[PDB]
């Protein structure tokens, strides 16, 4: 039985006593105990496949900072990895693919993985984490969006210019669509399995959508995330399960996204909170906005950025505080704790 | 004596018969003859220091596509290289620095290079190119903005998260300012020397400004580019010399930039041309907007993107067509030629 409501209420723009908080990549190297467990797993790849350890790292943050929500520890490339492509995580270079989807054949041959079957290990963690959280807080299930995933699947990893997907997009659009569509069906099944296995909320990372035109962003990215939402079950375990979409950088596309069906939209320090709320506030809840590097600042300074960001939004009800990007390994542990306390202490005035 | 006016007129929002065109990084590997001359120089570093060869590559594009303007071949890291920091161009990794500016000492010890003296080689190319262009087209002089330069000088090269400058920014702002200010003085001297040595126009690349807050973007980036403009000589050789500022991604900051003093603002496919013009059009001229990857498309398709982009703007007078980012080596030569002809042929209707 769940005790903390905040997160779930805020995403639904429902009154809360204080604003909720959670940090992207709260299960990361900035935590000494995290770096340890990761060494028990061997490589990141296996860490993400081990249910006991995957959970443990998801729990480490909650034992330091009373965060209103936890996000299963997994990888965005979970689905593409289960599509027979040769994916490895070089602790130096980066996520790489030996057989990147090139043309149409590559796409038609691409298979839809059974979440419970081939991706049944991320489902295991969900089950574990839920039983572990012992009702203390809601569990967030996640996945990349059809497009940013197709990026790595075509680029073969992380590209600095995405020179390939676009050569495809602008010269073989039917192919990119064949692909993106399959990826839509896939992740929809993928996300529902999480929801069924315990996920009480869910979020889609379209981390690269902002590298596109407003035309192409909508053609090849929004449409597909939208489909997921039209096909996700908004309810389970007697509760409405929330959905948050997040295109880093796409602060201007903010208007179209709201038409998505989705309950919440994520933001990054590139978009003004007030601005965003003034443009979609009464339509969708908003998630975080701070700059992760700000966590390097002295406690006092950080606190005033929580206060700054809390204003610009403030007055209402639909807000979940958060960073615009995951935490960087070098950030000090008690510095995040300062941040997590600033949002609670200083946001309570905007709910009275 | 100059014959082509287009570029210079358009930036000044003055009537032209057709819209002008020029591509960022038109002196690049996509040109077979470019890859050759680069091999004559040895490494990129020396290619940028050799006046004869630097010019030659700047001229290669004009012998294939009748572009309304040419940009001296040089590097943004010209100034930081002349500041005693240890900079090398690894054809694999990237621009690296052995002694990155770390704290205040690093900044106070940092020297202002005499353009004609220590950077007198980029001035040589200017003189050469101008005499080479034999009046056919105006020469653009360029440099990075104080901030994006301070990026490489602090990060030591290209960072994917700029994790360091920001740790500085948010924890040692006086230091980052000490730095940025010096960099402002520097580049101002740097750019004037180009203007004096033949540059008929000039442009500042703040390629990383968009990775910042709107608050910080203005504090640590705009202010400093602005200073340059307040200190650049808008006239020389009987002509008003134009100034173009360009923050890739900062399409939303578009309003503040116009208050800069600058004549033209650059854009990337992330910002809608029509939108931009509707927001600053009657205040500043705009430069390009297309996606470089679009050049992979079939001629017919490219042409319609020139036509699309020409609309959204169209009707007026203050526009210079361009890409939102340099050309990628793999783009076919006659494909750019198609693009360069589409802007001339199809833009002439918007000036009648």
From Swiss-Prot, chains A, B:
* Top-level taxon in the UniProt lineage: Bacteria
Sorted alphabetically, which InterPro entries does this protein's record hold?
UROD/MetE-like_sf (IPR038071), Uroporphyrinogen_deCO2ase_HemE (IPR006361), Uroporphyrinogen_deCOase (IPR000257)
Q: In which pathway does it act?
A: Porphyrin-containing compound metabolism; protoporphyrin-IX biosynthesis; coproporphyrinogen-III from 5-aminolevulinate: step 4/4
Query: So where does substrate get bound?
Result: 25-29, 44, 75, 152, 207, 325
Where is it chiefly localized? cytoplasm
Q: Name one GO biological process term.
A: protoporphyrinogen IX biosynthetic process from glutamate
Q: Per its UniProt entry, what is the enzyme's top EC class, as one word?
A: lyase
Alphabetically sorted, this entry's keywords are: Cytoplasm, Decarboxylase, Lyase, Porphyrin biosynthesis
MF (Gene Ontology): uroporphyrinogen decarboxylase activity
> What reaction is this protein's catalytic activity?
uroporphyrinogen III + 4 H(+) = coproporphyrinogen III + 4 CO2
- Which terms in the GO cellular component ontology are assigned? cytosol
Q: Where is this site: Transition state stabilizer?
A: 75
According to the UniProt entry, what is the EC number of this protein? Answer: 4.1.1.37
Localization in the cell: Cytoplasm
Residue ranges annotated as coiled coil are none
Family in the record = Belongs to the uroporphyrinogen decarboxylase family.
Q: How does it assemble?
A: Homodimer.
The record's function comment reads:
Catalyzes the decarboxylation of four acetate groups of uroporphyrinogen-III to yield coproporphyrinogen-III.
- What is this protein's name? Uroporphyrinogen decarboxylase
* Protein encoded by which gene: hemE
């Amino acid at each position: 039985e769940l005790k903390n409501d905040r997160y779930l209420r805020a995403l639904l723009r429902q009154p809360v006593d204080v604003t909720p908080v959670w940090m992207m990549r709260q299960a990361g190297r900035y935590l000494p105990e995290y770096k340890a467990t990761r060494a028990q797993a061997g490589d990141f790849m296996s860490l993400c496949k081990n249910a006991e350890l995957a959970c443990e790292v998801t729990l480490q943050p909650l034992r330091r900072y009373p965060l209103d929500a936890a996000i299963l520890f997994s990888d965005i490339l979970t689905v593409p990895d289960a599509m027979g492509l040769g994916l490895y995580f070089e602790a130096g270079e980066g996520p790489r693919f030996t057989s990147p989807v090139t043309c149409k054949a590559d796409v038609d041959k691409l298979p839809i993985p059974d979440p419970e079957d081939e991706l049944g290990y991320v489902m295991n963690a969900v089950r574990t984490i839920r039983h572990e959280l012992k009702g203390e807080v809601p569990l967030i299930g996640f996945s990349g969006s059809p497009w940013t995933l197709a990026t790595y699947m075509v680029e073969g990893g992380s590209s600095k210019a995405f020179t390939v997907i676009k050569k495809m997009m602008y010269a073989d659009p039917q192919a990119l669509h064949a692909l993106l569509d399959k990826l839509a069906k896939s992740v929809t099944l993928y996300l529902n399995a999480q929801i069924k296995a315990g996920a009480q909320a869910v979020m889609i990372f379209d981390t690269w959508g902002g590298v596109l035109t407003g035309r192409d962003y909508q053609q090849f990215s929004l449409y597909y995330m939208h489909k997921i939402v039209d096909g996700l079950l908004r309810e389970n375990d007697g509760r409405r399960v929330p959905v948050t979409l997040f295109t880093k950088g796409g602060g201007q596309w903010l208007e179209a996204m709201a038409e998505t069906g989705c309950d919440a939209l994520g933001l990054d320090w590139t978009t003004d909170i007030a601005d965003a709320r003034r443009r979609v506030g009464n339509k969708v809840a908003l998630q975080g906005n701070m700059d992760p590097s700000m966590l390097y600042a002295p406690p006092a300074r950080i606190e005033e950025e929580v206060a700054t960001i809390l204003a610009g939004f403030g007055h209402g009800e639909g807000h979940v505080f958060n960073l615009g990007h995951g935490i960087h390994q070098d950030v000090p542990p008690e510095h995040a704790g300062v941040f997590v306390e600033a949002v609670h202490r200083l946001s309570e005035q905007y709910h009275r």
